[PDB]
Amino acid sequence: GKKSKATKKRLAKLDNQNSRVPAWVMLKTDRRNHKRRHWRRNDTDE
Amino acid sequence: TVLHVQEIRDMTPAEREAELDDLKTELLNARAVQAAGGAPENPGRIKELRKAIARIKTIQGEEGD
Amino acid sequence: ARSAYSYIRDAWENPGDGQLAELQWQRQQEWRNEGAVERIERPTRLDKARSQGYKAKQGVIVARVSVRKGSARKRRHKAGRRSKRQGVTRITRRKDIQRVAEERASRTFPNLRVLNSYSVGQDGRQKWHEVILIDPNHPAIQNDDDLSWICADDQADRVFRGLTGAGRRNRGLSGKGKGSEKTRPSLRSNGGKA
Amino acid sequence: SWDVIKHPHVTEKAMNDMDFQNKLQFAVDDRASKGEVADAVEEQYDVTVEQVNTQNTMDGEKKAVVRLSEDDDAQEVASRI
Amino acid sequence: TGAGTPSQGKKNTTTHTKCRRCGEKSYHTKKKVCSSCGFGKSAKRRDYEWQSKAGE
RNA sequence: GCUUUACUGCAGGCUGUCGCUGAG
RNA sequence: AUACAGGGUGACAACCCCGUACUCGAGACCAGUACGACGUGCGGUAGUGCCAGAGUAGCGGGGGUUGGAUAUCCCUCGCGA
RNA sequence: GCACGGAGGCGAAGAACCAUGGAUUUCCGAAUGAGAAUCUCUAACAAUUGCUUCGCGCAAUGAGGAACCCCGAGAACUGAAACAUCUCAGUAUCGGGAGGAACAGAAAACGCAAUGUGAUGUCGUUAGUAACCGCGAGUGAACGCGAUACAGCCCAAACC
Ligand SMILES: [Cl-]
Ligand SMILES: [Cl-]
Ligand SMILES: [K+]
Ligand SMILES: [Mg+2]
Ligand SMILES: [Mg+2]
Ligand SMILES: [Mg+2]
Ligand SMILES: [Mg+2]
Ligand SMILES: [Mg+2]
Ligand SMILES: [Mg+2]
Ligand SMILES: [Mg+2]
Ligand SMILES: [Mg+2]
Ligand SMILES: [Mg+2]
Ligand code: NA
Ligand code: NA
Ligand code: NA
Ligand code: NA
Ligand code: NA
Ligand code: NA
Ligand code: NA
Ligand code: NA
Ligand code: NA
Ligand code: NA
Ligand code: NA
Ligand code: NA
Ligand code: NA
Numbered sequence: 044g045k046k047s048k049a050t051k052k053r054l055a056k057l058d059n060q061n062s063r064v065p066a067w068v069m070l071k072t073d074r075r076n077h078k079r080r081h082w083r084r085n086d087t088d089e
Numbered sequence: 090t091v092l093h094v095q096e097i098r099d100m101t102p103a104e105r106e107a108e109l110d111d112l113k114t115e116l117l118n119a120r121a122v123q124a125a126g127g128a129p130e131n132p133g134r135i136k137e138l139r140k141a142i143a144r145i146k147t148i149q150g151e152e153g154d
Numbered sequence: 155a156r157s158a159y160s161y162i163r164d165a166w167e168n169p170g171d172g173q174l175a176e177l178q179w180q181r182q183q184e185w186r187n188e189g190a191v192e193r194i195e196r197p198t199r200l201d202k203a204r205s206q207g208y209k210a211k212q213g214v215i216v217a218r219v220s221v222r223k224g225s226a227r228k229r230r231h232k233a234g235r236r237s238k239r240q241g242v243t244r245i246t247r248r249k250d251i252q253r254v255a256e257e258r259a260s261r262t263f264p265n266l267r268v269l270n271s272y273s274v275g276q277d278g279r280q281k282w283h284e285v286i287l288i289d290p291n292h293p294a295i296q297n298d299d300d301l302s303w304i305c306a307d308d309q310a311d312r313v314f315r316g317l318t319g320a321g322r323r324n325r326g327l328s329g330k331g332k333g334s335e336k337t338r339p340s341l342r343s344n345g346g347k348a
Numbered sequence: 349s350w351d352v353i354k355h356p357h358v359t360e361k362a363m364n365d366m367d368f369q370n371k372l373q374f375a376v377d378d379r380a381s382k383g384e385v386a387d388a389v390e391e392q393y394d395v396t397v398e399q400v401n402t403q404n405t406m407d408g409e410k411k412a413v414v415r416l417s418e419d420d421d422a423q424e425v426a427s428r429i
Numbered sequence: 430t431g432a433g434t435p436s437q438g439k440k441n442t443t444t445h446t447k448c449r450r451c452g453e454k455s456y457h458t459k460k461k462v463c464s465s466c467g468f469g470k471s472a473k474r475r476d477y478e479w480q481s482k483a484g485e
Numbered sequence: 486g487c488u489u490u491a492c493u494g495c496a497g498g499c500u501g502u503c504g505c506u507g508a509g
Numbered sequence: 510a511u512a513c514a515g516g517g518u519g520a521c522a523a524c525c526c527c528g529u530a531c532u533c534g535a536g537a538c539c540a541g542u543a544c545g546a547c548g549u550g551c552g553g554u555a556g557u558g559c560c561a562g563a564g565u566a567g568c569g570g571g572g573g574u575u576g577g578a579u580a581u582c583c584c585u586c587g588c589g590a
Numbered sequence: 591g592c593a594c595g596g597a598g599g600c601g602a603a604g605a606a607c608c609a610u611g612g613a614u615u616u617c618c619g620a621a622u623g624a625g626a627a628u629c630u631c632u633a634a635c636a637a638u639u640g641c642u643u644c645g646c647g648c649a650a651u652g653a654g655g656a657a658c659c660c661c662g663a664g665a666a667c668u669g670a671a672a673c674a675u676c677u678c679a680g681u682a683u684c685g686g687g688a689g690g691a692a693c694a695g696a697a698a699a700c701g702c703a704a705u706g707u708g709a710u711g712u713c714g715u716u717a718g719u720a721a722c723c724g725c726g727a728g729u730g731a732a733c734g735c736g737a738u739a740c741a742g743c744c745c746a747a748a749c750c
Contacts, residue, residue, distance in 0.1 A: 156748090159747075201746090204747090208746095212641065228663095233665085238674085239664095239665080247662085248663090253661090261638090262638075262639080263640075265640055266639070290650090303744095308688065310687085314686055315659095315661055316662085317688090324661090329697090329699080330697050330699050330710090331699050332700095338711090340693045345679090347680070
């Protein structure tokens, strides 16, 4: 299925949010990404 | 920091624009050293350049250009 | 002696007799081809108009409004409804045709607010009423002592809140005495029992 | 006011095109047309622009492939920054 | 042919997409009207008094 | 839910009359 | 101690710290209101049938509503001072 | 910033922080040049109005807001130990709209009938009284008094 310039951006953001919390924030907070979206298991919008 | 307020005002309409285009270029050669995995950074400065450009534009509008 | 106005006012006491009747039979013909909301340049009933608030000023507008004659164009109940609520033909609205006219008009002229209204005839399948509107954003009226108040924010979209003269008459707020128990100060604060 | 050139795209592939083809890859604002990309490049690095190829990245940004005329040298331009 | 498992296979038509106005995936691209905010049908945000209890 | 010469209704059709509606 | 309300502080704190009473200041609301001032001119007699809001007052039919009974309020049809 | 890492930077040119006023303030959005699932195509108050130098020139409306408010549209389960009037109830829900509050309001009033009271809300009471009702279930005021807060005005016409 073809996409629009817009959708293509949304998908991209949706993929960036899908990265893990930096190992450094770990140490700064002295101690989990609750929005980890797998491609197969989960479904985005649209 | 390396660029204060009074000083921005003492300049002429043409100097702000000249300095703005000077910093814009340094900020641009900054993002290139970073996008290149570069290490000779000085983190405080790349931040400053942004705030400086704000100060300059902020004054440009304040003086009537 | 009698003013010129008093003639027009008298003529209209029996619109079926004399010259006015000969007039109605004419205009009405031209009135039936005209749209619902038509802006006319001058009041048909100059007297009544003036006596309602009319003035030959900038920002004072008049207009005729034609509405279908009849009873509740109520659709029949589709689900289960007991014998009493099974009406469609007979039951009529609780809002008189004149008031319906005022609204169709105020809408047509968004920015304007409604001063008053009055009847100007009716045939076998429609009734006409003229409407006096005012432009509360025009300095003429903002400066005119006699109309100034209509600019007040709390006067905006007044015809829709029933704040007209024809409105209060419909709401049963004429007599300050007997009968007005269930209408003053408002229908909603009386549980809608009038 | 939005800036056309965001920054130089430096990757193994970008180098290839640069070495053997004299091409400079960039990161540019997504509203910037090929033509616009052209100008801002000639103006920022003082060169002659031949052709520009654009592409909207799966990184929310647009990617400009710009080729410098047979007179200018890519490798030399990208090194002074 | 069951309406179940077997008829789930044809379901590959797109309908409700990301509404430009409210930001929900309720913009029916075949009707071009949002099921949530009502964008495309009303200039006024769709809102009903039954989205909550009566005395609330 | 359905039915009918179950009770009470309602659209709807037919009909008189009122207005629209005037001239000999 | 006009301050023994409450909190903090390595355990139960008036006197360790924040504050608390006393006094003081600033905004907002009251309100462009009260008062004041400026202009305008209140009132009274005799005479004069010159003026005072119409599909209105009101009547009848059909619906509705009300505690409103004949004696609630509204709508519609027709007649109408 | 939360958020206590690492690198670095800022602050006596008085930073941070706070208060007030100002600047900037992408795209969709009443969304308004036109089209569109947040982007696109070649100058814009789109649409409806008002004033009008009749030129979008000057203006107005649109949409949001916890609930309150105002005018319209208006259920049924249920109660009546069934059930049709009645009840639930002018409730729920729907349509349109205003403000910081709304609405009402200076008597063609009241009618403790009087030599009397004197705009309108609201609170207390009158009172579950009068009145209504397969007179069944049930529904149910007012004048008045006691309080709160008080405030009074303008056209139309005669005559110019
Ligand atoms: Cl109005
Ligand atoms: Cl009394
Ligand atoms: K029932
Ligand atoms: Mg391409
Ligand atoms: Mg009843
Ligand atoms: Mg648009
Ligand atoms: Mg039942
Ligand atoms: Mg029962
Ligand atoms: Mg009230
Ligand atoms: Mg019984
Ligand atoms: Mg009742
Ligand atoms: Mg009474
Ligand atoms: Na999936
Ligand atoms: Na209006
Ligand atoms: Na009633
Ligand atoms: Na990047
Ligand atoms: Na059944
Ligand atoms: Na009648
Ligand atoms: Na802002
Ligand atoms: Na406008
Ligand atoms: Na114009
Ligand atoms: Na029962
Ligand atoms: Na039963
Ligand atoms: Na007494
Ligand atoms: Na009964």
